[PDB]
Amino acid sequence: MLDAFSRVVVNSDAKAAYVGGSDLQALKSFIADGNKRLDAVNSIVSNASCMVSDAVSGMICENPGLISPGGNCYTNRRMAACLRDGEIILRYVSYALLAGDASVLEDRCLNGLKETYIALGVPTNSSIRAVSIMKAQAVAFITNTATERKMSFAAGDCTSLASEVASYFDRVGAAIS
Amino acid sequence: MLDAFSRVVVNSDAKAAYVGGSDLQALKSFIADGNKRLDAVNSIVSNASCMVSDAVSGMICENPGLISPGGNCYTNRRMAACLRDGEIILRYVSYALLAGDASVLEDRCLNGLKETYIALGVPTNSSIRAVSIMKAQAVAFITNTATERKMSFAAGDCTSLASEVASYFDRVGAAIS
Amino acid sequence: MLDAFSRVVVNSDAKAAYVGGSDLQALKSFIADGNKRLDAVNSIVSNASCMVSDAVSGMICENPGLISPGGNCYTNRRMAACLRDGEIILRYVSYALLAGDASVLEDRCLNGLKETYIALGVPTNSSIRAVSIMKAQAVAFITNTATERKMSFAAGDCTSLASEVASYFDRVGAAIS
Amino acid sequence: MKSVITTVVSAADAAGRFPSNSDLESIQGNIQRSAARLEAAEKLAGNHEAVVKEAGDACFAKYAYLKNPGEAGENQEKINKCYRDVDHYMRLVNYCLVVGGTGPLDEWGIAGAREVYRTLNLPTSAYVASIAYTRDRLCVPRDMSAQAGVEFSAYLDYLINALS
Amino acid sequence: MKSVITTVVSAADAAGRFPSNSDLESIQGNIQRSAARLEAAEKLAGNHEAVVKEAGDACFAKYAYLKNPGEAGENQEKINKCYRDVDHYMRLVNYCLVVGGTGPLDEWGIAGAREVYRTLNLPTSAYVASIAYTRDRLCVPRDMSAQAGVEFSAYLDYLINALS
Amino acid sequence: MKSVITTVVSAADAAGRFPSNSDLESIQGNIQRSAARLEAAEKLAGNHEAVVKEAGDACFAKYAYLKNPGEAGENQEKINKCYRDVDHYMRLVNYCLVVGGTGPLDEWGIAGAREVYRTLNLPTSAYVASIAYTRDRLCVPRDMSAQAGVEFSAYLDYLINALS
Amino acid sequence: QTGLVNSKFSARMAKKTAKQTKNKVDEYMARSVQRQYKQAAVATGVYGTQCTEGTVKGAAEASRSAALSRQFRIKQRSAFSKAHDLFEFRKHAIIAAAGCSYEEKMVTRFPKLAAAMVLGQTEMMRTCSRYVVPESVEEEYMAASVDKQMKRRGAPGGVYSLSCAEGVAKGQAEIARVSALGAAYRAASKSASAVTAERYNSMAYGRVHFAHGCSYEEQQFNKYPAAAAAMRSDSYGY
Amino acid sequence: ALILAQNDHQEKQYIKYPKLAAAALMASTEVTRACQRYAVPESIEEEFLAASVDKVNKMRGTTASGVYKSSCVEGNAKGQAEQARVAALAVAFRSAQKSASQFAAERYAQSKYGRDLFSSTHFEEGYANTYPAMAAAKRASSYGY
Ligand SMILES: C=CC1=C(C)[C@@H](Cc2[nH]c(/C=C3N=C(/C=C4\NC(=O)[C@H](C)[C@H]4CC)C(C)=C\3CCC(=O)O)c(CCC(=O)O)c2C)NC1=O
Ligand SMILES: C=CC1=C(C)[C@@H](Cc2[nH]c(/C=C3N=C(/C=C4\NC(=O)[C@H](C)[C@H]4CC)C(C)=C\3CCC(=O)O)c(CCC(=O)O)c2C)NC1=O
Ligand SMILES: C=CC1=C(C)[C@@H](Cc2[nH]c(/C=C3N=C(/C=C4\NC(=O)[C@H](C)[C@H]4CC)C(C)=C\3CCC(=O)O)c(CCC(=O)O)c2C)NC1=O
Ligand SMILES: C=CC1=C(C)[C@@H](Cc2[nH]c(/C=C3N=C(/C=C4\NC(=O)[C@H](C)[C@H]4CC)C(C)=C\3CCC(=O)O)c(CCC(=O)O)c2C)NC1=O
Ligand SMILES: C=CC1=C(C)[C@@H](Cc2[nH]c(/C=C3N=C(/C=C4\NC(=O)[C@H](C)[C@H]4CC)C(C)=C\3CCC(=O)O)c(CCC(=O)O)c2C)NC1=O
Ligand SMILES: C=CC1=C(C)[C@@H](Cc2[nH]c(/C=C3N=C(/C=C4\NC(=O)[C@H](C)[C@H]4CC)C(C)=C\3CCC(=O)O)c(CCC(=O)O)c2C)NC1=O
Ligand SMILES: C=CC1=C(C)[C@@H](Cc2[nH]c(/C=C3N=C(/C=C4\NC(=O)[C@H](C)[C@H]4CC)C(C)=C\3CCC(=O)O)c(CCC(=O)O)c2C)NC1=O
Ligand SMILES: C=CC1=C(C)[C@@H](Cc2[nH]c(/C=C3N=C(/C=C4\NC(=O)[C@H](C)[C@H]4CC)C(C)=C\3CCC(=O)O)c(CCC(=O)O)c2C)NC1=O
Ligand SMILES: C=CC1=C(C)[C@@H](Cc2[nH]c(/C=C3N=C(/C=C4\NC(=O)[C@H](C)[C@H]4CC)C(C)=C\3CCC(=O)O)c(CCC(=O)O)c2C)NC1=O
Ligand SMILES: C=CC1=C(C)[C@@H](Cc2[nH]c(/C=C3N=C(/C=C4\NC(=O)[C@H](C)[C@H]4CC)C(C)=C\3CCC(=O)O)c(CCC(=O)O)c2C)NC1=O
Ligand SMILES: C=CC1=C(C)[C@@H](Cc2[nH]c(/C=C3N=C(/C=C4\NC(=O)[C@H](C)[C@H]4CC)C(C)=C\3CCC(=O)O)c(CCC(=O)O)c2C)NC1=O
Ligand SMILES: C=CC1=C(C)[C@@H](Cc2[nH]c(/C=C3N=C(/C=C4\NC(=O)[C@H](C)[C@H]4CC)C(C)=C\3CCC(=O)O)c(CCC(=O)O)c2C)NC1=O
């Protein structure tokens, strides 16, 4: 895997370049908000065990076809496996948000995740929503705008990091499709 | 795995034949001229460890795109693997010349090798040149026409062994193309 | 394994007590001496591959009995095996100075090693003479008293960290005696 | 590609764990110590073309035997490929200033180096002579800071120690 | 200690077999081919002090940089330790021509040799140029017989090809 | 033919003496500095077409007036005689690096050249500008060795001095 | 009609192709040999001791989904690492099925047959680290030295691989704690004939898969075959 | 028609009667299934090689400006464009229901259709021999589509 620092390396390696002064202004502005990025994902992991149970129970109340007899969440195994890979894609989006790049996403979680969901007959349009319900929960916790939890945090702008995790969840939503 | 004496044992098994005197004439011509074959295998493997640096660096200086940044022989990890498979092939063509038939070649090395080199992103035409230089030195070492290395052999005509290993090297160049 | 910051928990739990200011007398001074520790750990890893060869060659000019035929360092198999273990024992004491505690030595390196070497034929006289050279070489780099290479530092004292790494090295000497 | 991030999210993935306050403490260490090594980054990135020239001839000043026929610098075309190899090692050490770890050394320069330099008869002692000429000529408050010099010399010896 | 007689029993022990007629045909190679390799082995041992002294200075005549201070051959006891190392390898070619295989070469002088010559800063080019001077200074009827000079050379450059 | 051997016995004959113990030391200097002047000579032999192609048009890029009617290179036979006369000079530079002294230059190339080139209106400053072009074309680790460039750029500015 | 690139809606080429028919042979060939290999486990009617999934009531189904998650991490391997797992398992199956040209030609076609033979032949003869316990602290430290060396493939550059990970969910590693010590005590409570079969299997196993003529490597294996059964292949990070 | 005509009489029939030759080429790609409407590609890149030559076939479905021609239309009444869409998908599922003999026949004959009608060079002969679905999608340019 890579990070947000070493993404600038491989974009400068292919043109045989040293990282010059104009390309260092992005990384110095990256580490200027480095306190905010650690403050961001500390809100997410602290509410992570309730966020998945917020998510996958919100899809049963949105669509009752999963708890049909013979459905994909009919079995206590198959519900628990729907809990199990609901928090892994939460675990990897928190890895990518701290790393500042999706370089952990498409190679430790998203390789072959689509066609393993194809081979079981997993309803993908529900899992489009099951990713996106955690996108609605992630933008609230990173802005402290969640309507049942106001956390102790320093004031200031955080909206670009809100779009950064919003640009990570549709990456999971694209490769599932 | 099969060899030259074991090449007509399976054609005799397909037609239920005992191995008779009309068929055994090629094998007594093999085993009488097999002392030249012993004299030609050690002509290669005594000089084999510089022959791959004679070839892979010959491939670089003809096609310099491999050591370009991003290229397939750019990093030190990749150039270690290219000098590895330069002598992996030279290990197996010395096997098949010694066994008198190429039955060791296209089942342990060349089998599955084309789609392996496709999926790794290896430029296939440069690996044609990497084994062509090893073809051009194999008939140069066998006929003692190697212009910076002459090893003493018992004199006589030896172009049949040169044409046998040149008929094995283009089996490498056609199975991976 | 443990370290300096979990050395306090394994004694306080036996009386089941919180760690207060009476227990903070050593660890509040640990982070004041933290940068000096990182400046010390960086100097041992700096000349570390030359540190191994400065240790095994000084053992040979002290005692030429191992280069004797049948002596335990006769072959390249046997010489490189303590060129291997010249940088095993040096690696864990670089772990030990970084951890602030030698708790990593006796549970994965030192246990059973004392009775190991008598069954392999590794002699007990030179193994003490292998480690004792690296004690005097270690304190040349903590206090920067190495007489043929100087490293850049901020000025100050290091008599605590000098005697602390030699207090780690004799645990190896108290093991294999 | 080791760095501060990619080892602690790797221990978090090998356990299957989450990023907790053991893990976020390390990236705070890559805020204070990162400002020192980025101060050495653009100093080398703008002045790489002169430091490879001073490291280039000092490879062959200490070793005059490479210009003999049969050895590595036998003509003035293979000498030109030697100067690129110092220039690549000056570029990979620039990348390890940026990522924080020795990743672009270990992935891109170290792994397989102790095979092909033996295979192409490239003497490794000439490589450690050319790197060490750069290392001892940091007059430390002129090239960079006092903190950047003890960080940039802390990657050059990793080129010395992995090649020896 | 790999020889012809050892590789045909380790295969049969791996397959759980008694020695069949294929293995008995392989020991015939230790009958008629064993005449020439037994000739050059004691003939090397009968001339062994002359091959080490007269090739040992031919290595240093090629590499005249080795008598500089800071190198390997700066003083007398390291040049005298150099003469022991050439006498180590020509004892092994004398060893390997007796047993018929590449046995004493690989178990004693090759395995681990790529790590010790790196860590002690010993140039591996001087090891192979010293032994290749003995190979090209082989007259075919005068040093040994005709076919022993094949087996002297083909066992020699196996020791070249391991360090190069 | 002034060399090291053909001066120490042209002084041993001028006093009617034997080969002295002085003169057996002067041939011990021929053993030491040979390997920098032979390796500078063998580099010139496999590169001669390239180095006299570049030296010759350094005269004509500088001096465009030579194609005027009545000047030195006014037709193609005279251009061919210009590139011949710089092919001869660096052949003698190759000869002086084998003999080891300045013998083949000043008795085949320099003696007479003040009197030949004045009578035929061949300018000395165009002969100098071709030879002084390739004196600073020499790159010290790239082309040859460090001390091999000293021997090769000793006979070059010998010829620049003796012509000017 | 026109392809899926331009001006179309639904997915197509719903057909058993040449590769998925190759893959469906490949899984059935891989499922056949472990069926023959677990036949050697339950050789009589009663089961062997060495295939208990767990002992805790929740440890049975948690041992399944953890090992099933390992099979997806085979599929998640990068294209260099997938091709690395081809040719060493091609090489080590010629070592496994030793002299049979029919058995070695069948493993040079099918690829998950090579992934299935080299596990089960090490578990027919029980030459893995889960089955052998060293008797002495000489041999305990000897097997801990080689097991520490094989874990370096998991972390090549200080970053652990995907194959090194025991758990993927919360609380999965502590279930993997209690299985291996349960596998350790089941390796310790074996019969009088079981532990002396493994001592002569493993030094016969290390002498063919890893030694290749070296007298030093076999002399360590014939003293300590617990290091020999800790010698696994280069494919796995553990 | 002049390059798939067997004898001299049949090439004389295709010259004089232009409606015969246009139905000869259509009936030649039914007796083998070398049309696009029966070709199913094996690999995903074999589908992408088919769509690379399929975009050039739609480029002659317009005029030189870029106005959509009357040749490539896919509906006439209201809802016929959906009626053409609901029907051609049932054709392509019936393309998947061939036998293994019928797949192996059309694999070796789509290359024969491609390498004898649309290749004067070597590289198109290599593309026809390797991806037979790419050779199946080269239409004749008498059709608009
Ligand atoms: C029919 C069933 C049903 C549900 C279960 C919820 C599920 C749900 N929650 C949110 C939206 C959210 N969901 C959570 C999650 C949680 N809130 C907390 O305080 C805990 C940490 C955690 C529950 C344990 C959060 C924090 C938000 C953002 C708004 C907020 O709560 O402040 C959204 C998107 C925004 C919206 O449309 O409302 C949805 C669909 N909604 C439903 O219609
Ligand atoms: C037993 C059979 C057998 C072989 C035939 C070889 C060939 C081979 N090479 C590679 C792997 C490789 N092989 C090459 C080689 C080359 N690329 C080029 O551009 C050159 C033409 C050529 C060198 C001459 C490179 C560069 C890699 C590494 C690719 C990478 O790391 O991205 C791999 C994948 C496993 C690995 O990572 O090494 C294999 C199987 N190795 C074997 O085990
Ligand atoms: C552009 C870069 C470039 C190179 C680096 C060389 C490399 C090189 N040499 C040969 C050609 C050869 N290469 C060798 C190999 C060797 N020769 C020896 O004396 C050793 C024994 C061994 C190296 C250890 C041999 C034996 C020949 C045949 C001619 C001969 O040397 O007698 C060939 C193939 C035919 C040819 O192109 O000449 C190449 C590419 N040539 C190049 O064009
Ligand atoms: C253990 C290793 C081993 C070997 C290397 C060979 C060694 C070998 N080669 C030949 C013998 C020979 N070798 C050659 C070969 C050649 N002549 C040429 O001009 C070409 C350069 C080259 C062919 C490529 C010829 C022509 C003979 C003589 C014919 C013969 O004896 O078969 C002979 C018989 C004559 C003699 O005693 O010297 C032997 C023993 N045999 C072995 O057992
Ligand atoms: C990432 C790697 C890493 C390091 C290498 C260190 C680098 C380092 N060393 C010191 C700083 C220091 N280091 C030493 C230690 C010594 N001085 C000597 O002359 C002795 C040779 C040696 C004694 C053992 C001392 C005495 C100071 C200054 C006092 C202090 O800051 O504690 C400081 C603080 C002062 C400054 O900001 O410059 C730092 C950041 N820290 C890191 O994070
Ligand atoms: C996991 C922890 C770990 C270590 C602490 C080191 C140390 C170590 N070295 C050896 C093994 C060995 N160690 C030595 C070393 C020496 N012999 C001497 O006389 C000197 C004291 C010294 C070199 C100067 C030798 C020579 C062998 C091989 C023994 C033999 O060949 O018989 C062994 C036994 C296992 C093996 O054979 O590899 C261990 C544990 N290596 C490790 O893997
Ligand atoms: C017969 C063989 C023989 C040796 C090899 C040396 C080995 C050696 N070195 C030191 C002592 C030392 N050894 C080193 C090591 C080194 N110095 C460097 O700068 C490098 C990093 C590294 C060599 C690669 C250092 C740094 C010291 C401390 C003194 C100093 O050199 O500043 C000591 C302790 C002093 C003593 O007790 O006598 C010994 C035995 N001495 C010997 O008698
Ligand atoms: C990005 C990572 C990267 C590296 C670490 C280097 C490593 C490297 N060096 C060389 C290749 C070489 N390297 C040298 C280098 C030297 N010879 C000397 O006189 C000195 C010892 C030294 C320079 C100071 C020479 C002479 C060659 C040419 C060898 C040949 O032509 O076969 C090659 C083979 C292909 C090539 O010519 O580039 C590679 C991979 N190159 C890379 O792309
Ligand atoms: C990019 C980072 C960077 C460095 C690591 C240094 C290193 C360095 N210094 C010089 C160039 C120089 N370097 C020095 C410095 C010294 N000479 C000595 O004798 C003292 C030991 C030491 C004092 C600190 C001097 C005096 C010069 C002028 C020319 C020379 O003497 O080399 C050059 C050649 C190009 C130039 O002139 O800048 C380089 C690369 N300078 C840099 O710009
Ligand atoms: C079993 C077989 C066997 C060998 C192959 C050698 C290998 C070897 N050489 C050295 C050690 C040495 N070996 C050499 C020899 C040389 N250095 C050079 O640069 C030249 C290439 C060469 C002389 C021609 C020198 C000079 C040393 C001293 C360096 C040191 O001790 O660190 C050592 C360390 C102990 C010692 O001093 O002997 C060993 C094991 N010794 C053996 O027992
Ligand atoms: C106490 C038990 C014990 C063993 C039996 C060995 C077994 C062994 N060998 C290797 C590793 C190796 N083993 C060899 C084998 C050999 N090298 C040679 O000089 C000979 C030709 C041949 C031995 C006869 C080689 C060439 C490697 C390096 C390949 C690699 O692992 O990268 C490794 C991987 C890590 C390591 O190097 O230690 C292990 C565990 N080591 C042990 O600790
Ligand atoms: C058992 C194996 C064996 C050998 C490898 C050689 C080994 C050998 N021969 C000579 C010595 C010699 N070797 C030769 C022979 C030749 N010189 C040449 O340049 C020609 C290539 C060749 C003629 C065919 C001669 C004429 C001498 C004596 C003069 C000299 O010192 O070279 C020397 C130098 C020491 C000495 O003078 O004795 C050595 C080591 N002799 C052996 O007994």
Ligand SMILES: C=CC1=C(C)[C@@H](Cc2[nH]c(/C=C3N=C(/C=C4\NC(=O)[C@H](C)[C@H]4CC)C(C)=C\3CCC(=O)O)c(CCC(=O)O)c2C)NC1=O
């Ligand atoms: C012949 C009959 C046969 C069997 C009874 C099973 C053996 C088997 N393996 C595993 C389970 C496993 N088995 C392995 C296999 C190995 N570990 C390694 O390091 C080696 C490469 C390899 C042989 C020792 C691994 C990696 C796991 C998952 C981890 C674990 O054991 O928990 C389990 C689940 C319970 C457990 O964890 O032990 C069982 C029953 N396979 C068979 O083929």
Ligand SMILES: CCC1=C(C)[C@@H](CC2=N/C(=C\c3[nH]c(C[C@@H]4NC(=O)C(C)=C4CC)c(C)c3CCC(=O)O)C(CCC(=O)O)=C2C)NC1=O
């Ligand atoms: C006796 C059988 C057995 C075990 C071992 C452990 C397995 C185990 N590994 C852990 C945690 C863990 N797991 C791994 C992976 C794995 N471990 C390594 O030491 C290396 C080198 C690995 C890759 C092969 C690593 C690297 C860590 C350390 C990560 C960390 O806690 O920071 C944890 C703690 C998880 C947590 O903190 O919640 C456990 C319980 N349990 C068992 O039942």
